C-alpha cells in the first residue's frame, strides 16, 4: 500500500492507491484512502486499518468543535491532534497518517507521522509499505515548486512504479487536489498509466 502527498506552487496534491490486501485475498479494491477531516485539510491513511479509522473519527470530532468555538484549524493544528492520539496509545493503535492541507495564509504543508507518533514537516511525504520501492525515484526526480501539470504527473508516475513493484498496491490511483480554487477529485484508471 502506497500513500503520498507533494507540495507545489498552488498548494498540495495528495495521492493514493486503492488496494488493501489482507493476506492473499484483496478485501477491497476501490478503497478511498483519502479522507476529509475538515474541508480543506484531507488526510491519507495507511497501516492497521481499523486503528487508523478509529483515530480519524476522533480527530474529526476535535476539528469540527475547534472550528465551531475558536476558528478554523491549520495543517499544523490538525496534524497535532493526530499525533497526540498515536503517542498516548502508542503500544496498541498503530497509524501512519499523512496530513496534507491548503491554508489560505501559508499555502500547502505536509506532515508525516510514522507509527511512534512524532510529527515532521516535509515538502513531500511517502509512508506506507509499498513506498520502499520508490524512495530513490521520489527524491531524484522531485523538484520543490512545480507547476500543476507537472505535479499530477510526478505522483502518477511514482504510484505507477509502486503498483509495478508492490502487489499490496493496486487498482485506481486516486488524487485529491487542494488549492485556493478549491477541492477537485481526479481519478486515473489502470490503462491510463499502464500505457506508459
Amino acid at each position: 500500500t502506497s500513500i503520498m502527498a507533494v507540495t507545489f506552487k498552488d498548494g498540495v496534491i495528495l495521492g493514493a492507491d486503492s488496494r488493501t490486501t489482507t493476506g492473499a485475498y484483496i478485501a477491497n479494491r476501490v478503497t478511498d484512502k483519502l479522507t476529509r477531516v475538515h474541508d480543506k485539510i484531507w488526510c491519507c491513511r495507511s497501516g492497521s486499518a481499523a486503528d487508523t479509522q478509529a483515530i480519524a473519527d476522533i480527530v474529526q470530532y476535535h476539528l469540527e468543535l475547534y472550528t465551531s468555538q475558536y476558528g478554523t484549524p491549520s495543517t499544523e493544528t490538525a496534524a497535532s491532534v493526530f499525533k497526540e492520539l498515536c503517542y498516548e496509545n502508542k503500544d496498541n493503535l498503530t497509524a501512519g497518517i499523512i496530513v496534507a492541507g491548503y491554508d489560505d495564509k501559508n499555502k500547502g504543508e505536509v506532515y508525516t507521522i510514522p507509527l511512534g507518533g512524532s510529527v515532521h514537516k516535509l515538502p513531500y511525504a511517502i509512508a506506507g509499505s509499498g513506498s520502499t520501492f520508490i524512495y530513490g525515484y521520489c527524491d531524484k526526480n522531485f523538484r520543490e515548486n512545480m507547476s500543476k501539470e507537472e505535479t499530477v504527473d510526478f505522483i502518477k508516475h511514482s504510484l505507477s512504479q509502486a503498483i509495478k513493484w508492490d502487489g499490496s498496491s493496486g487498482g485506481v490511483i486516486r488524487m485529491v487536489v487542494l488549492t485556493a480554487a478549491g477541492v477537485e477529485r481526479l481519478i486515473f484508471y489502470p490503462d491510463e498509466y499502464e500505457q506508459l
Binding site: 470530532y61 468543535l65 465551531s68
Partner: protein, 241 residues
C-alpha cells in the same frame, strides 16, 4: 416558607422561580424577528453599542453553533455564552456517534431537557435566556425552533422576542392571515431579509443604520452572518420598495 427561592412547587402548583426567568429574558432590551423563506431562513436582531470604546464586531448575539445552525439569543449575555457552549458541544457529539449533521428538531429537544433538569434540581440555577434556533433542514425544510426557560419548545412559521415583541407579533400575524400560507414565498434569499427589515421598521417605529442591525442567514448547508458593509446594501433596497 421557602419555595420562591428554590425549585419546589407552590400551593398553586406553579414555580415562581421559573416565572422570574421569563422576566429576566428582556433585560437586554433587544428585539429580534425571524421568518422562514422558501429555501432560506432569516433572523435580524438589534445590536447596540453603549459607548465609543466598545467595538461592535465582538458585540454579538448571533452565535454559530453547528455549521448550518445558528442561534440568536435574547436575555443576558452570561447565560447566552453558557447556552451557546453546551449546544455547540452537543452538536459535535451527535456527529461523532450517529455520523450525520444534527437535525434542529433534535437540538431543540435536547436543550429542552437540560433546561428542565435545572428546574428539577434545587442547587442548579436555570438559564434565563430565550434561544431561537434557525436552520434549513435537508429533510424537514426551513425551520425555527424556539426554546425558553421552562424547557419547552415549539416550531414556528415566524416568531419575535424581546420586550416590545407584542407589537411585532401582530404585524407578523396579519401577513400570514391575509395570505393563507405558512411561509414567505420567494426563492432569492436577499429579498426575505428585505421583507423582514420593513416589518421591523414599521413595528418598532424606527429606521435603522448598519450598526443597529446584525443579520444572520442560513441557506443550504451553511450559516453565515452578513458584514456591516453588505447590510447597507439591504437598506438601499428599501428605497426601491
Amino acid at each position: 416558607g421557602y419555595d420562591r427561592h428554590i425549585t419546589i412547587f407552590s400551593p398553586e402548583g406553579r414555580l415562581y422561580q421559573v416565572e422570574y426567568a421569563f422576566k429576566a429574558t428582556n433585560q437586554t432590551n433587544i428585539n429580534s424577528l425571524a421568518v422562514r423563506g422558501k429555501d432560506c431562513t432569516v433572523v435580524i436582531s438589534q445590536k447596540k453599542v453603549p459607548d465609543k470604546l466598545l467595538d461592535p464586531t465582538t458585540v454579538s448575539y448571533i452565535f454559530c453553533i453547528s455549521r448550518t445552525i445558528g442561534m440568536v439569543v435574547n436575555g443576558p449575555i452570561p447565560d447566552a455564552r453558557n447556552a451557546a457552549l453546551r449546544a455547540k458541544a452537543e452538536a459535535a457529539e451527535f456527529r461523532y456517534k450517529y455520523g450525520y449533521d444534527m437535525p434542529c428538531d433534535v437540538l431543540a429537544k435536547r436543550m429542552a431537557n437540560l433546561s428542565q433538569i435545572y428546574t428539577q434540581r434545587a442547587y442548579m440555577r436555570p438559564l434565563g435566556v430565550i434561544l431561537t434556533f434557525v436552520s434549513v433542514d435537508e429533510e424537514l425544510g426551513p425551520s425555527i425552533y424556539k426554546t425558553d426557560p421552562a424547557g419547552y419548545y415549539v416550531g414556528y412559521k415566524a416568531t419575535a422576542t424581546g420586550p416590545k415583541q407584542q407589537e411585532i407579533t401582530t404585524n407578523l400575524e396579519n401577513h400570514f392571515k391575509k395570505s393563507k400560507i405558512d411561509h414567505i414565498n420567494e426563492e432569492s434569499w436577499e429579498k426575505v431579509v428585505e421583507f423582514a427589515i420593513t416589518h421591523m421598521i414599521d413595528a418598532l417605529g424606527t429606521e435603522f443604520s448598519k450598526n443597529d442591525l446584525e443579520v444572520g442567514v442560513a441557506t443550504k448547508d451553511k450559516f453565515f452572518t452578513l458584514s456591516a458593509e453588505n447590510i447597507e446594501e439591504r437598506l438601499v433596497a428599501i428605497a426601491e420598495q
